[PDB]
Amino acid sequence: GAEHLLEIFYLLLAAQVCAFIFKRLNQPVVIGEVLAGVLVGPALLGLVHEGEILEFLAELGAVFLLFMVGLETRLKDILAVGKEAFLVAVLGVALPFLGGYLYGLEIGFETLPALFLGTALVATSVGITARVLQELGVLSRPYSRIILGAAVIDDVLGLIVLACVNGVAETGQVEVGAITRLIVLSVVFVGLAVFLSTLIARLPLERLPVGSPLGFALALGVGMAALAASIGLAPIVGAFLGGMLLSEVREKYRLEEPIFAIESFLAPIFFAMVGVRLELSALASPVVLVAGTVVTVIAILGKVLGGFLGALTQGVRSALTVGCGMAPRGEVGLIVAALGLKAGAVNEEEYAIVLFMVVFTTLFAPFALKPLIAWTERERAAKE
Amino acid sequence: GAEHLLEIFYLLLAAQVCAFIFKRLNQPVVIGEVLAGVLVGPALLGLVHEGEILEFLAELGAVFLLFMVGLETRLKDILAVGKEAFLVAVLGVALPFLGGYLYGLEIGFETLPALFLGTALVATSVGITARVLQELGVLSRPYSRIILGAAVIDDVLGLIVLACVNGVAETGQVEVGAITRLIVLSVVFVGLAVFLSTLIARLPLERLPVGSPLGFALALGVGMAALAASIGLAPIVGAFLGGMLLSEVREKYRLEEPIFAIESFLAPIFFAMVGVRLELSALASPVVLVAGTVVTVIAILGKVLGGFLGALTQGVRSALTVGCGMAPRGEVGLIVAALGLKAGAVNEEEYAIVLFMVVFTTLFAPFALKPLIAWTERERAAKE
Ligand SMILES: [Zn+2]
Ligand SMILES: [Zn+2]
Ligand SMILES: [Zn+2]
Ligand SMILES: [Zn+2]
C-alpha cells in the first residue's frame, strides 16, 4: 500500500532527474526515462520491483501517450499517406522476420525457436518513437504520420504472426479459423473506428448524458483501448484510434492540454517500467553478446530497410526517418520474449539473445532518430 | 489485463452519467460517483469487482483530490483559524467515540466491540467533503479551511485511537511506547511539512536537476503521500500537505490546471470504488436496520456537534457547515469496519450495523452540506 506509493515516487524522481541529465545532453528524454527504470529497478538499486499494479499503470501511460498523439492526428492526414503506411508495415514485418528465421536456422536454433526469432524481429514499439516525435513537436509531419498508420497496420500483422506461432508451439499446426477470425475482428474494429471518426464533429456530445466533454473523452479512449485489448490487439492502438475519433473536435473542447497533462504524468512510469523489466543476462555473457549483436544488426537493418522502401515516395531523407522510427522493440519485443520463454519455445540462452536486441534496439533507435529528424527538416526548408 | 481496462471504462462511464443525473438535480456530484460504483459494482451489475489495482487507482484519486486542495490552501490560511481547527478535531473524535462506546454497551455489544463502535464513529472522510467544497468553488472560505485543518488533526487522533484499539484486540493492553512513537512521528512529520512550506517560494526549483516544475510537483506530492502512509497516516494527508508546500508557488508554475486535470481523472474512480465496496447487508435485515439507524443518528449528531462547538467562533451558520462537513465516514469508516471484522473483534451483525452507518453518513452528509453552504453565503452577504 505504501509499497506502491513509494515505488511510484522512486520511478517519478528518477525519471525527472534522468530526463534532466538527458535534456542537458541534447538527447531525447525517453532514454532518460527508461534508464531511470534501469537505475531504480532490479538491475541496480532494487528500490522498484515489478508489480501487477506498476505494470498496469505503465499500460495506462502508453495508452495516454497514444491517445494524445491521435488527438493531434486526423484520418485525412494518415490516409493521404496510407499507401506508404501500408507498404512500410508489411515490409516491416516481412523483412526482419525472414532475416530472423534464417539467422536462427544458421546458429543452430531449431525451427520453432527460429520462428520465434523472426517473431521478435517483427515487433515494433511505436510508444517510444511517438514519445520522441512528440518531444520535437513533429507529430504533424508526413513521416510521423506514416510511422503512426504503418504502426497500426504493423500491429495487426504482428498479432497474426504471433497467433500462427503460438499455434505451432501448442499443437504443431496453424488453426486457420482462429487466424481468419483475428483478421476479421481487426479489420472490422479498425474500419468501425474510422467510420465513427468521420461522424464525431457532426455530433457534439451535448445531448449525451455525460457530465463533461473531457470525461467523455477519457471514457471514449480508455474504452477504445479496452476494446482493442479484448480483440487481441495492443491497447496502444485502441488509444490512438480513440484519439483520432476526437481529433476533429479536439480544439473545440480544450482536450489537447488536460490529456497532455495525464500523458506527462503516466508515460514516464511506462518508460521507466520498461527499464525496470530489463535483465542482467548480457552481463558477463559470450554467445549472448555475439549472436545478440548479429541478430541486433539484422533487426535494425530489417526494420529500417522495410521503412525506407515502403515510404521511399517521400524521398530518402524521410524514408530512413520512418525506417529508423520502426526500429525500437521496447515493451512489445519484451512481451514476445516472455511468451517465448513460457510456452517452452526458447532457452534462457536464446532469450538472452533476444532480450539483448530488444534492449539495444530500444536504446539505439531514438538516438539515430533525432539527427535524422533534423537532417530531414533542414532539407525540407531548401524546398520550402 | 483487458479485465482492468474494461472495469475502469465501466467506472468512468457510469460515473460520467451518474454525475449528469445528479448535476441536473442541483445535487452534488460525489453522490453520483459513489452511486455509479454501487450501480456497476457487486450490488447491482457486477461488471466491476474489487481489484488490488482498482483499489490503488482509487487511492491515487483521493491523493490528487487533496493535493489539488492543498495547492489552493496556504499555511497562513489554516493557521489563522487553526485553533478552531484543533478544537473541531478533538471534539470530533471525543464526542462520537463516547456516544459510540456507550451505545455499544447498551445494545449488548461487549467492551471490545463497543470500543470498535466508538472507533468507527471517530472516523472522518474529508475526501468526499473536499470534493463538494471544490465543486461549489468554496475551498477559500473559512469553514472549508477549518474543515481541512481540523481534518488533518482528526487523522492523527483517529490513528492513535485505532492504535490503542488494535492494541487491546491483540494482547489486551495498550502498548504505550507504540502510541507515543506514533504521536512523535506524526507531530514531527506535520511540523516538518509546515516548515518546509514556509521555505518553498524562496527557492524556485530551477537549480534542481528535475526535468519540469510539474514533474517536480508530482513527485513532491505522491512522495508526501507515501511518507504519510509509511508513518501510518492516510495518504490523503501527505497529499494535502504536499499541496500546501507548493501553494505559495502554485500560480507561478501553472500547477492548478494540470493537477486539476489529473484529479478530475482519478477522483471519480476513487468515489466510484467507494460505492463498489458497499455490501447488501442492510437488505432484508432487521436488528441491522434498527441499531444501525440509532448508531447513525449518534454518528451524525456526534460529528456535527463536535464541529458546531469547535468552530462556533465563526457563528452558527459556519459552525454547522463545519460540523456537517465532518459527518461522512466513507473509505475510512469502511476501512475501520474491515479491520474490525478481520482481527475477530466484530460479528457480521455488528459489522452490518457499522456499515449501515458509514453508508448512510456517506450519503446523507453531502446532501445537507449544500444548502448549508448557501445558507451561510447568503448570510455572509448581509454582513459584506
Ligand atoms: Zn500490492
Ligand atoms: Zn516493491
Ligand atoms: Zn489483475
Ligand atoms: Zn473484474
TrEMBL record, chains A, B:
The membrane-spanning stretches of this chain are: 4-22, 29-47, 53-73, 85-103, 115-134, 146-166, 178-201, 213-246, 258-276, 288-312, 351-373
Q: Which InterPro entries match?
A: Cation/H_exchanger_TM (IPR006153), Na+/solute_symporter_sf (IPR038770)
Binding annotation for Zn(2+) 1: 3, 7, 49
Task: Offer an example of a GO molecular function term for this protein.
Answer: antiporter activity
Got a GO cellular component term for this one? membrane
- Ligand binding (Zn(2+) 2): 4
Q: Where in the cell is it found?
A: Membrane
Per the UniProt record, one Pfam family is Na_H_Exchanger
Instruction: Please provide the record's keywords in A-Z order.
Output: Antiport, Ion transport, Membrane, Metal-binding, Sodium, Sodium transport, Transmembrane, Transmembrane helix, Transport, Zinc
What processes does the entry annotate via GO biological process terms?
proton transmembrane transport; sodium ion transport
Record carries keyword Transport: yes
Q: What is this protein called?
A: Na(+)/H(+) antiporter
Which species? Thermus thermophilus (strain ATCC BAA-163 / DSM 7039 / HB27)
Q: What is the lineage of its organism?
A: Bacteria, Thermotogati, Deinococcota, Deinococci, Thermales
